[PDB]
DNA sequence: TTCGACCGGTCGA
DNA sequence: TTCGACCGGTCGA
DNA sequence: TCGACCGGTCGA
DNA sequence: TCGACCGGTCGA
């Protein structure tokens, strides 16, 4: 029956045939009776040999490892997309929202803000352009938001994800769509960076993303001149975090050390290693409270 | 014939065979009469090719494409250490150097600072670590590496390089020791980060680049209360720079838009495409002038 | 005699004698507004008064309860000599205002509702601290607007004599701005001083200082790097190199980096000779 | 016996006979035996009296207030630089130093700094001379200095001064001098305004004077990148504090503001109304400690 | 078709 | 070994 | 000439 | 009562 799988698809590209994996279609083919659980990585190996045992038998070639980091990629955010689904829905958080997010161009995550704070944000940028030497604000969204503003969960959310379909898969991803331009600047209390894995230097990519949200939000503080809002950036490695990741991701936003008595923050305040999916709950506890 | 050739190297781990590729030997190879020029892209391609055919006439396996991801990298920084060598060479100036830097960990960058100098880093990184928060400011050290020095430069530095050779490539790769501990804080007038190619999260790590190196360079000039000394961090990809690619390197240092009144700056000053040699003597005519 | 410049009242059977510098100004003005030096004016209206007593059985007012009226007259002669100055200039989008004291009105009244707002979030934040901090300065004597809606046809009638009214309608101009004013119409205000001395000149530096403050969270709130407020400061007597280096001092909060330009508490002192150079003075104010 | 004191002098103002309050032997003759205690605000006046009972017993005018006015002050800041001076011999505080300074012209407090510190605070007032609009940072030296540093204190420093005498008071007077050039800038630890009367506009001057005071502290901070030394400044007035007065004591460092994570500071950081010298000790306790 | 964001497989020290 | 820094091959919108 | 002091007001 | 003004010193 492997040979019935969809997770991996063919096309014709330019007169090329080439093999395309749907990281979705493996997913929901595996754990569309229970949503996964346990070691995290084991998860990703047994849904990665799941693609190459069904290519293998479709007769087709294993797909490239550009195509299997981008896949396990994906395979990460949504099982922790859905864990925390459900992880405020057992833990009760009725006024508090874990979103995955699409990417910046799909829906620029500033969207979520209501005008107000919208257009504080465009003060900044046309401000910011409005300069010899032209300067911006770009980070990729950032993968996971936790928003904190009771009017904003509707009833559906308080139902839990117990297996993967087309259809739970994407009311989990389309979550976002729901709250834009409704958020209140304060309501969004912090965001989470996943990676299956790190690297000496894509690890870096988490302290600058950090580091321009946490320069954004030290912005609407000034702009509602309210020293008492604070946003929190965080990591999360399906691996283990070596003493040297740990480090890194411990560098300052830049802006919060210019001066003596300014006091450091960090881009990223913590990084944590989620080995289990116990470990996501226990992260998200952390990060919540 | 190629069955001869170096740029693979074959060898056993855990009994397990294994090819690896000697990426100085495919440059030393197939530049040791004269050094490249033209075209950065199909030097890089010719580089490549010449390692594979090397591979099917050696028999062996045809290494993966993460293999040539790293060596193409080593290649592209290769060749513009060598064409800036020779730049500063026949342009004249006995007061600069352009320096490919190693890693961190062989070499940390902050080394080439004089001991007044690397002393105010200290009580620095020694103060953002005396927190219940501790903060740190890492940043993998910057490919290149301009220095402005007088009393720095040798006569050796003058002879300009031909010809790849194990020689020719080690002295342009280990130029960094000569200036250990010998720099003024101020005679470091820029960095510069090469890549072969971007992408929407790889070229974020220029800007952090860029923003931790100003970040430091801002700590000295009031350390030593000099509002004059400047330091200017660039990119350089082998390939065209797309207009997201700009807008996202037009990101300003967080530390220089905090004041409604501060002046924004760049992370990254300026991202070159240097499609060939040429450009990359035009880029250093633009960063140096 | 018959002149009211000077008064006798009740002070626990002790009768004293105090001096109502209005009438002084009035009295001895009801003719025409004075000109030429502002220092020999100024005693002109001290020497009405020196003698409204010496002819009517009275005694000398203390160094000091002329100094305070010396003061005063000073003032309403650059405060009525502006009025005179933007009608015979044209004008007619800029309010020069001789300002009360910050009692009788807090000059941060004359912001409009959004602005007034921004200021309480913050002076309302700042005594939220376990260490209560707060912005307080003296009105600035004199305050410089400029927003066209906020010009009355009426203040276009120059006052070319002291009157009891040409007096009250002036040190009442600014009751006609209040709550009118957009944060960004302020552009400039002068501290106005007969002397100086080496502490007292110190205030200068201090008035602005808090002003400059005060805008400058006005410009974040805003972020509007383009606004400025200026403040000056004016002498009828000449300016020591002392007192040009003590009034060079700039804003502690403008030199926090060394990025960030300094600038100075008080960006100029006038040393007004005569009338003709409070004139001048606006010219450089006003730009 | 009155008639030849020495608490006043005729010197000659261009013909007219001009009286002279001279303050220090007023307070040499009325102590001539012993240091003024009880009440501050009592024994004023009568140092006022005494000289005001030599004048018109040698058939003079009871000289100006305005020449009592300035009078006046000093008899203020000499019994509070005496009662200092013993104060830390009762309490014995062999490592801190209460100095009565003279003008700024006189002996710049900037003086009291070793080298080194001297030399920061240079960089920094020449570099504020290095604009288009010069910008300084001037105000009066503050009227009591505090510094604690072992190294600075005299064995004669510890004979307390029981009685006024010229010897004695020219010892209270001159102390700064001992200390020219040897304070290491975190030595300094408060200095104190010293006001007989407050009014609306001269209480303002105690902003100003802590504010300029704390900007260069600020700086050196900076300079030693230290944010654990600390300046106090402190205003003491022998009368009564309104409300008002202490409201506007209240003005906080325009440079500690200036943040809305800034953590805000007062220029003045408490008020003194000293009416007994019994208060000038419980004052004093304070500040040290 | 282009752009966004993902990461795994190195070679060298 | 592990740690530093490199980047090319995706899948989705 | 300059530094720093403050007490005696007039008005609200 | 509180706001803001400044002129008359004594010393260096």
Same mark, same amino acid.
């Given at each position: ?40 990585? !084991? ?33 990460? !955010? ?77 009833? !559906?959310? +308080? ?66 001149? +309210? ?63």
């Amino acid at each position: 029956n492997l040979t019935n799988s969809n997770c991996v698809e063919e096309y014709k590209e330019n007169g090329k045939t080439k093999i395309r994996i749907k990281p979705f279609n493996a997913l929901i083919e595996l754990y569309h009776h229970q949503t996964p659980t346990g070691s995290i990585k !084991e998860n990703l190996d047994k849904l990665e040999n799941y693609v190459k045992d069904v290519v293998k038998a479709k007769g087709l070639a294993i797909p490239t490892s550009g195509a299997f980091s981008n896949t396990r990629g994906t395979w990460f !955010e949504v099982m922790i997309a859905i864990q925390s689904w459900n992880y405020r829905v057992k833990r009760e958080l009725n006024d508090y929202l874990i979103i995955k997010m699409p990417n910046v161009k799909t829906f620029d995550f500033r969207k979520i803000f209501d005008n107000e704070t919208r257009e504080k944000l465009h003060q900044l940028e046309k401000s910011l352009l409005t300069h010899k030497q032209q300067v911006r604000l770009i980070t990729s969204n950032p993968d996971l938001l936790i928003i904190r503003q009771k009017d904003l969960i509707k009833s !559906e959310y +308080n139902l839990p994800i117990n297996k993967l379909t087309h259809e739970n898969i994407d009311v989990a991803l389309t979550l976002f769509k729901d709250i834009e331009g409704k958020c209140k600047w304060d309501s969004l209390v912090a965001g989470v960076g996943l990676k299956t894995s790190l690297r000496p230097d894509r690890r870096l990519q988490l302290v600058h993303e950090g580091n321009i949200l946490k320069s954004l939000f030290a912005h609407l503080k000034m702009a509602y001149w +309210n020293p008492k809002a604070e946003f929190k950036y965080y990591g999360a490695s399906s691996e283990p975090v070596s003493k040297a990741d740990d480090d890194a991701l411990q560098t300052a936003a830049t802006h919060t050390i210019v001066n003596v008595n300014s006091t450091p923050e960090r881009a990223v305040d913590d990084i944590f290693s989620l080995t289990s999916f116990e470990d996501i709950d226990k992260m998200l506890d952390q990060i919540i409270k």
